[PDB]
Design a protein around this motif. Structure first.
Motif, PDB file in Angstrom:
ATOM      1  N   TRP A  44     -15.968   7.099  -0.048  1.00 33.07           N
ATOM      2  CA  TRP A  44     -14.560   6.776   0.199  1.00 33.07           C
ATOM      3  C   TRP A  44     -14.358   6.199   1.572  1.00 33.07           C
ATOM      4  O   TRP A  44     -13.471   5.368   1.761  1.00 33.07           O
ATOM      5  CB  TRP A  44     -13.630   7.962  -0.054  1.00 33.07           C
ATOM      6  N   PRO A  80     -17.300   3.356  -6.125  1.00 31.59           N
ATOM      7  CA  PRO A  80     -17.812   3.139  -4.772  1.00 31.59           C
ATOM      8  C   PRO A  80     -18.878   4.167  -4.380  1.00 31.59           C
ATOM      9  O   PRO A  80     -18.947   5.243  -4.975  1.00 31.59           O
ATOM     10  CB  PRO A  80     -16.562   3.300  -3.892  1.00 31.59           C
ATOM     11  N   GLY A 136      -7.593  -0.522  -2.918  1.00 30.45           N
ATOM     12  CA  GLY A 136      -8.646  -1.193  -3.644  1.00 30.45           C
ATOM     13  C   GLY A 136      -8.107  -1.840  -4.904  1.00 30.45           C
ATOM     14  O   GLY A 136      -6.904  -1.830  -5.140  1.00 30.45           O
ATOM     15  N   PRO A 137      -9.008  -2.386  -5.735  1.00 29.07           N
ATOM     16  CA  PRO A 137      -8.576  -3.089  -6.939  1.00 29.07           C
ATOM     17  C   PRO A 137      -8.040  -2.133  -7.996  1.00 29.07           C
ATOM     18  O   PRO A 137      -7.442  -2.587  -8.976  1.00 29.07           O
ATOM     19  CB  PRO A 137      -9.860  -3.789  -7.428  1.00 29.07           C
ATOM     20  N   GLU A 138      -8.249  -0.833  -7.780  1.00 21.79           N
ATOM     21  CA  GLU A 138      -7.730   0.215  -8.657  1.00 21.79           C
ATOM     22  C   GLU A 138      -6.368   0.760  -8.176  1.00 21.79           C
ATOM     23  O   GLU A 138      -5.877   1.785  -8.662  1.00 21.79           O
ATOM     24  CB  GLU A 138      -8.791   1.323  -8.814  1.00 21.79           C
ATOM     25  N   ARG A 156     -13.828   1.979   2.739  1.00 22.62           N
ATOM     26  CA  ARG A 156     -13.355   1.096   1.660  1.00 22.62           C
ATOM     27  C   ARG A 156     -12.118   0.322   2.118  1.00 22.62           C
ATOM     28  O   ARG A 156     -11.336   0.830   2.907  1.00 22.62           O
ATOM     29  CB  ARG A 156     -12.962   1.903   0.427  1.00 22.62           C
ATOM     30  N   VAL A 157     -11.939  -0.899   1.618  1.00 26.46           N
ATOM     31  CA  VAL A 157     -10.670  -1.615   1.809  1.00 26.46           C
ATOM     32  C   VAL A 157      -9.585  -0.866   1.037  1.00 26.46           C
ATOM     33  O   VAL A 157      -9.798  -0.465  -0.107  1.00 26.46           O
ATOM     34  CB  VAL A 157     -10.741  -3.086   1.337  1.00 26.46           C
ATOM     35  N   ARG A 158      -8.447  -0.656   1.686  1.00 28.95           N
ATOM     36  CA  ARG A 158      -7.314   0.047   1.086  1.00 28.95           C
ATOM     37  C   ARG A 158      -6.053  -0.819   1.079  1.00 28.95           C
ATOM     38  O   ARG A 158      -5.717  -1.418   2.104  1.00 28.95           O
ATOM     39  CB  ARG A 158      -7.041   1.354   1.828  1.00 28.95           C
ATOM     40  N   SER A 196       0.854  -1.182   0.000  1.00 30.80           N
ATOM     41  CA  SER A 196       0.000   0.000   0.000  1.00 30.80           C
ATOM     42  C   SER A 196       0.891   1.233   0.000  1.00 30.80           C
ATOM     43  O   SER A 196       2.111   1.121   0.073  1.00 30.80           O
ATOM     44  CB  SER A 196      -0.880   0.017   1.258  1.00 30.80           C
ATOM     45  N   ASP A 249     -10.137  10.286  -3.941  1.00 25.52           N
ATOM     46  CA  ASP A 249     -11.219   9.851  -4.808  1.00 25.52           C
ATOM     47  C   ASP A 249     -12.111  11.004  -5.208  1.00 25.52           C
ATOM     48  O   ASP A 249     -12.437  11.875  -4.396  1.00 25.52           O
ATOM     49  CB  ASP A 249     -12.052   8.789  -4.111  1.00 25.52           C
TER      50      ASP A 249
END
Ligand SMILES: [Fe+3]
Ligand SMILES: [Fe+3]
Lengths: 336, 313
Positions: free
Chosen positions: A83, A80, A90-92, A86-88, A27, A123
């Motif tokens: 913000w 989403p 993310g898939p982006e 969210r899991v951090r 991350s 975001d």
């Protein structure tokens, strides 16, 4: 305005790199990723590095766009609803990494401690509860143009906006200064310390806590500006090709300064009329020079169904150490 | 103080890279070299890149050294008599290019139009023309666009003549003195002394300024004792300044940059001084190269003749 269009080979190479790095690092919480950023950015296609280096060094045009990235929609997933929570990452994450690589070619990514949990990549998508008024998480209502944080001595030097999706092709507005449209008389006035630029509420030290000497000191310079209300210029740098800091909403022209009012009005008209719609469609990355361009947003009706326009945003500083007084530690990239 | 010692493999890679670049580009007068610098610097050994990046981001130490470069003494040739009139680039171009690569990892190389013919890389060697007082300072302490870092490459140093480097130990100072030093109460005067566009002196002398800044708990400093003065009436600022000088003066260290060492000085966290030494004046004398680094080239735009130029003044 110069731009760069990636060939499909270049888009594939950029995409592969961002997937590899996304797998290699956990991350942005990883201090090593932040360290490695400029060296990793040297793995981007050479034409891309050359192009951004030229943009940076030319110090002439106030924005540029790199178009034709491959942003895998299936991998990225639905836009989403918020913000928060969210899991951090993310898939982006690969797209976030891309923007961090680009930020490292221009300077250092940095953020604001109170904004979006302190995330370096922000975001930009519609949030239903935020539907009322002017901001980035909105949609329904207009966002008039400005220099980002015009009043602030440590405001962004560049902004990077990556469009992950934009199904309805909602453009961003950007405007530059055509200096030939202004009289030499007006230019000289605009270069003089004759204007007051007020902070946005989010920067007011009375927003945060009053405990400890450490945090008081972190806001002491801003507090001083609020208390003394120093007058400053709207134009600076070179008289032949000037930088500007223009946020009409937070700008006060002193009532008795007739020349400052005439010159400001001329400046505002020139920038307002020069405003351009720049579409950042899926796969476009927009770069804004915060010293040469103003930016705004157009209102749009959101669907709130996971299909909405989704941008990522990174703020760039040319000199991280300059803001040290407002950062809690030497290592942190967050002001406040 | 952290330092990095190159392996022979790393030293050979760097030497090869600098020779390659020296053949590929004509001079620092080549704008395309100046463009390519950061990308070219990413061709240096990864351990070297990581090390300098850690120094830059740690924002903790006042200096660091990368040791063990291979500086080919035969190719570099004899230490010149003077910088002025000397054809540039010389045979030591690869070493100058190295420091420029290093400068691109840290920020941007820049220079002073009125210093050494406006060359981006300065020469530091004994010049024949010359009670030697020992002084130290922040580089260009008065100037708002002063260097953020300094890079000193030791091409040769036969008698191992050190450089002085001093940092700020806070624990010796009172919170009272620190607060006063953070306030704009001090005068710092400029150092030593084309036709257009608006002749020479442009954005000149103006207000009083602080000596300490940044974090109250781990401050940056700008300290040039010889050019620093305090209004007579301001007794608090005089007391605090005396205390700051004493602390910095007493903590001064000697750092040797021997042949093949590159010394990096953080101009916000360290003062530096030169030490007098007896020269031979026979072409074998100590020879350093110096590059000045700015974190933000655009910030000095008003004192630069064009957008492209890296020379102030
Ligand atoms: Fe904005
Ligand atoms: Fe010096």
């Amino acid at each position: 305005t110069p731009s760069y269009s990636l060939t499909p080979a270049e888009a594939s190479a950029v995409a592969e790199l961002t997937l590899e790095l996304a797998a290699a690092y956990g991350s942005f919480g990883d201090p090593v990723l932040l360290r490695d950023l400029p060296r990793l950015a040297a793995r981007l296609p050479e034409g891309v590095q050359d192009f951004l280096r030229e943009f940076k060094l030319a110090d002439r045009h106030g924005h540029t766009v790199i178009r034709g990235h491959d942003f895998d929609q299936r991998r990225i997933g639905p836009t989403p609803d918020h913000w928060r929570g969210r899991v951090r990452p993310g898939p982006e994450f690969p797209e976030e990494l891309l923007l961090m690589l680009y930020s490292a070619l221009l300077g250092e990514p940095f953020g604001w401690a109170t904004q979006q949990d302190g995330h370096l990549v922000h975001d930009i998508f519609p949030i239903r509860s935020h539907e009322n008024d002017q901001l980035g998480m909105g949609s329904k209502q207009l966002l008039t143009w400005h220099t980002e944080d015009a009043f602030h001595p440590y405001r962004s030097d560049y902004l990077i906006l990556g469009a992950l999706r934009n199904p309805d092709h909602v453009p961003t507005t950007v405007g530059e200064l055509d200096l030939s449209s202004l009289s030499a008389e007006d230019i000289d006035v605009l270069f003089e310390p004759r204007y007051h630029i007020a902070p946005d509420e989010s920067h007011l030290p009375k927003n945060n806590t009053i405990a400890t000497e450490e945090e008081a000191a972190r806001f002491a310079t801003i507090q001083r500006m609020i208390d003394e209300r120093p007058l400053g210029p709207l134009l600076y740098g070179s008289r032949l090709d000037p930088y500007m800091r223009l946020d009409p909403y937070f700008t006060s022209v002193p009532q008795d300064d007739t020349d400052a009012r005439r010159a400001y009005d001329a400046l505002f008209k020139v920038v307002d009329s020069g405003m351009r719609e720049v579409v950042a469609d899926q796969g476009d990355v927009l770069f804004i020079d915060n010293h040469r361009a103003v930016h705004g947003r157009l209102p749009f009706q959101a669907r709130y169904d996971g299909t909405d326009r989704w941008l990522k945003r990174v703020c760039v500083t040319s000199d991280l150490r300059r803001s040290r007084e407002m950062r809690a530690t030497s290592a942190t990239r967050l002001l406040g």
